[PDB]
Amino acid sequence: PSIGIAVILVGTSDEVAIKFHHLSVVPRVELVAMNETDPKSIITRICDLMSDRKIQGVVFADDTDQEAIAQILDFISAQTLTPILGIHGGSSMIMADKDESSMFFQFGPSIEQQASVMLNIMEEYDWYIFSIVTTYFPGYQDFVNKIRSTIENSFVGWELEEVLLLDMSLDDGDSKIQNQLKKLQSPIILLYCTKEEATYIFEVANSVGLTGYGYTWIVPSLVAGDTDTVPSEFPTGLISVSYDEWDYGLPARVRDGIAIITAASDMLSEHSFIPEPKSSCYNKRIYQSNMLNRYLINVTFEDLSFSEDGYQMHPKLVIILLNKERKWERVGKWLQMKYYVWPRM
Amino acid sequence: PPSIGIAVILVGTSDEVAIKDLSVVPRVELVAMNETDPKSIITRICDLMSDRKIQGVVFADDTDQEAIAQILDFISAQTLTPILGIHGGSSMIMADKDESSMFFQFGPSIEQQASVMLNIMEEYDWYIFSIVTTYFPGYQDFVNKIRSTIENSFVGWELEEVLLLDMSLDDGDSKIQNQLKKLQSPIILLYCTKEEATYIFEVANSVGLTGYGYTWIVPSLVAGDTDTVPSEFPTGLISVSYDEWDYGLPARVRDGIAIITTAASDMLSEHSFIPEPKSSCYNTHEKRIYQSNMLNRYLINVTFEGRDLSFSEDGYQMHPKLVIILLNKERKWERVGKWKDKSLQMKYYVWPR
Amino acid sequence: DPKIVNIGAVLSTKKHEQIFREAVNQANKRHFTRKIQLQATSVTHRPNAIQMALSVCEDLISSQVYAILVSHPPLTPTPISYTAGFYRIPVIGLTTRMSIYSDKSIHLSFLRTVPPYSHQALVWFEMMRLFNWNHVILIVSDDHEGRAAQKKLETLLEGPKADKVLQFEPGTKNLTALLLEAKELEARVIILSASEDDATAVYKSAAMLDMTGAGYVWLVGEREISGSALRYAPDGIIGLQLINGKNESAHISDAVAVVAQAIHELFEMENITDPPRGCVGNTNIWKTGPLFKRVLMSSKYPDGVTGRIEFNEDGDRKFAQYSIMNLQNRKLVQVGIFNGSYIIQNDRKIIWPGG
Ligand SMILES: *[C@@H]1O[C@H](CO)[C@@H](O[C@@H]2O[C@H](CO)[C@@H](O[C@@H]3O[C@H](CO[C@H]4O[C@H](CO)[C@@H](O)[C@H](O)[C@@H]4O)[C@@H](O)[C@H](O[C@H]4O[C@H](CO)[C@@H](O)[C@H](O)[C@@H]4O)[C@@H]3O)[C@H](O)[C@H]2NC(C)=O)[C@H](O[C@H]2O[C@@H](C)[C@@H](O)[C@@H](O)[C@@H]2O)[C@H]1NC(C)=O
Ligand SMILES: C[C@@H]([C@H](O)c1ccc(O)cc1)N1CCC(Cc2ccccc2)CC1
Ligand SMILES: C[C@@H]([C@H](O)c1ccc(O)cc1)N1CCC(Cc2ccccc2)CC1
Ligand SMILES: *[C@@H]1O[C@H](CO)[C@@H](O)[C@H](O)[C@H]1NC(C)=O
Ligand SMILES: *[C@H]1O[C@H](CO)[C@@H](O)[C@H](O)[C@H]1NC(C)=O
Ligand SMILES: *[C@H]1O[C@H](CO)[C@@H](O)[C@H](O)[C@H]1NC(C)=O
Ligand SMILES: *[C@H]1O[C@H](CO)[C@@H](O)[C@H](O)[C@H]1NC(C)=O
């Protein structure tokens, strides 16, 4: 049997480098290019590709740093009960609290694992004293609680000084944020927010003298984002946790995302059927189920499984340092660090 | 609560008034049907299915045509739609339904009727007998069910002959006659269709095997409609029968609608979904990656109003109430026994003449 | 004018429809047709079983066909058999070899001009006497076709004897278990009946257990040296191909000749009624159906393009001819034919497994 799979590619993409089945179904892949990334564009393109070929799944890659894409895909996925894999760019920026009916999964570590790593980098170089700074970006609570529950377990004698919550949904005329930042004493600051948010926070921090020697910021994957795009406001010496395009390229990912969806075999081989792709986005719900998820989650190819939360169980993480020459440099692997004495940055 | 379409198809003179009296709720629609050849039946169902969203089908007819059961089974398996043959030919037991059938029939299995027959024999100490069947599907189930009940009993059963009759050829070579003229037993179990039985009986009589000294016992589908008695049926004929007496059409349609509705309910409330009724028969080759037997597991085990209305996987009823009937001298079928729960209770101690 | 008697056919392509039309035209020419003359009526296969049944009714039975030729398209003959059998209008299968069509309970008026797979047992048996293989292990798939081949060969054996018959669940990919049970037995001749994909599973396991070399004989059917079953088949295997078994043109030619003969023989009798016109509202069998079947079943056509045409008791073709094929240096080589009743070895030498 044949199942249709749309691979959507936003912006620059080597479509030639991108292009088997012993399984019970065969992927009829179609490589689709999309120009814009606003809600209408993404919704309009996916719905129409569905009111054409019968799409059993979507594999989605963009170049942009727009973490909103993930949110737009979760919504589209939950509304049409179509599996969607966010494998690269904004679509892979971890989405916290995906919809219950969501069939959206992303390549990348959970917020909780990224926090687990950061404390590991910390233990490595004996950085036991710190602060946290989040905005309200979803997952901020996931982040803080994982840090807080880890410390309490520990005899390592951590000391969390301040935890700040920055409301980035208002303007900064009162210079409220400047004042919240002025409260920070600690030498290590863990920051959780979006890339575009971080660029603002850093500027305000460079103004209050918190970005030089003696203040080290550690930042999750979605802040670093695309490493070939470095905002001038990022403090030299920025430590991030990225999802490496260095050992796991787009074509590898895109192949693996088709191996995930081509799930369908498992469910066919056990229930002698697969869900009929939403002929349209103009609906008739007592008919569609969530059944495919159970299978999209346990795919073993050459262990590609997920959590029901929608993130990879076993992602390879590279620790990166933004250096003086202002390129992102690989200084660790997830924990094995290049350095034994942390260099002055 | 959401609504499932249930087509109820009535063939032949039927009282619709008397007839027309959970997480999901039934939207019944009574449809009449005039003909029972394959094109008429295939067509009426495929049309019914392309207008509404029929989730299940309740089928009753007023005939003695066992072919209807097979037509339905094929439809049910091709389109993956539940179909319930509750009455008539539609309920005449079909053996070896398709692997993917969702066809279920109100009536006793072939093997149970055969067991019931042996119970009747044991009661009146009729232990010596012979078997006659045609190739009608089920005949092996019938002959083997007898053979292994016999084999496993501390009772003096004696099976003298088993004849197999080929009704697909003409009988100008007098083959049937020359086989029949070999029977000696005073009891003869006949397994075949009603139309076949009337030919067999006509022949057995010409060979002196119908009268006194010879008792024929026959299954529900030979008796068929008890208000239609071929003249060639011998007086004194015994038959098992699904009790159309105390269990009338309007009751059966009731339970029909219940089973398709209960079943659907049970499956939304454990899977958060229900199989979507295919709107077309012309499209069932492509669309079949997306279709499933799934409702069978629920259709098979519905308790309703404190009655266990469940089915076997083979698609017959688990606990049919059966009546033993005897064809009298005035050629009307007379009730002479009941089979309840593996328990046979007869009317007479001494058998009637 | 003569009485026009329609014959029907469900065939593969419009080309084959034209062959059918032409075969009937020739039958008219070669027969005396003052009283009765044949007319050809045909369609090609429908995309699914329900549409096919309906086509039978609207296109064929609507024309009162006395019989319906049916081939395997390029979706089985089943809907055609059920619909036609509802009326007892005979069906002549031209190319299906599945054994299920030999079952009178399901296929009431079905005859075919090719033998069912299971009849390959007749050749194996003749092969066992010839090369004096008195002790054999039978391996069959546990489905209808596997069991048919077993019943059929056990019948011929009950001389040479089967030491054990092993059966395996179709679709099972590791048969090391099954095959180790047969390695432990003495007999080294192994007969296999399985679909293509199951033969592949057996051949692999067989090889990994090193049961495919010198000393071992493998005797097989057609499905087991076809398509994919060939990709992993051991060398020195002996297999079969039904000669003309796939020639729809040849079988149309022969079926029409047998049927024309039977029609004329039928009208030498009295009280022959016509078939029903159309399906709608007709629920009685064609009264002359069972007699037409009897005449067909006992038809005998000696000079057939596919050989000598007679039908056995199940309406299956008798006197079929087989190519005896041996896999040599990974090439299928004809080492002989079974000519209907006799094995005839040609000049090409059999290389056994090992050699
Ligand atoms: C498949 O292969 C088999 C075996 O080769 C073949 O059957 C034989 O066919 C031949 C030729 O038709 C038959 O022959 C004549 O034999 C008789 C007497 O035979 C008896 O002894 C032999 C040998 O021990 C036994 O096998 C028989 O059972 C008998 O007991 C002989 O008198 C005769 O001769 C006169 O006619 C000759 C020409 O026919 C002429 O040359 C001569 O001068 C005489 O006037 C023949 O030589 C032979 O008996 C068959 N053997 C067996 C075992 O049955 C199959 O052939 C037939 O199919 C079609 C094509 C026709 O040719 C039929 O007549 C054959 O019966 C062959 N099958 C197919 C499908 O080709
Ligand atoms: C509310 C923000 C958000 O999550 C956030 C951003 C920054 C923060 O500091 C805190 C929260 N989102 C809401 C949904 C928007 C995308 C979208 C559009 C149409 C339909 C479905 C989804 C993308 C922006
Ligand atoms: C073959 C006989 C049959 O079972 C039988 C009857 C008497 C016997 O002595 C032995 C067998 N059937 C075959 C199928 C026919 C129904 C049908 C038609 C079209 C499509 C699907 C189904 C109805 C009659
Ligand atoms: C098939 O049979 C026909 C006889 O009508 C013949 O003309 C043709 O050559 C044959 N084709 C094959 C495959 O031998
Ligand atoms: C990309 O596709 C869009 C949609 O047609 C089109 O408007 C735009 O000009 C295209 N740009 C490129 C890179 O060709
Ligand atoms: C995945 O998980 C199931 C359920 O726990 C487990 O039993 C099974 O071994 C796994 N399935 C696969 C693809 O091996
Ligand atoms: C079918 O026949 C019956 C009996 O005469 C008739 O009452 C009924 O109306 C017919 N069907 C239609 C659509 O008229």
Ligand SMILES: *[C@H]1O[C@H](CO)[C@@H](O)[C@H](O)[C@H]1NC(C)=O
């Ligand atoms: C069928 O339904 C009953 C009643 O709820 C359930 O308890 C039972 O598990 C089912 N019976 C079968 C088929 O095992």
Ligand code: NA
């Ligand atoms: Na037959």
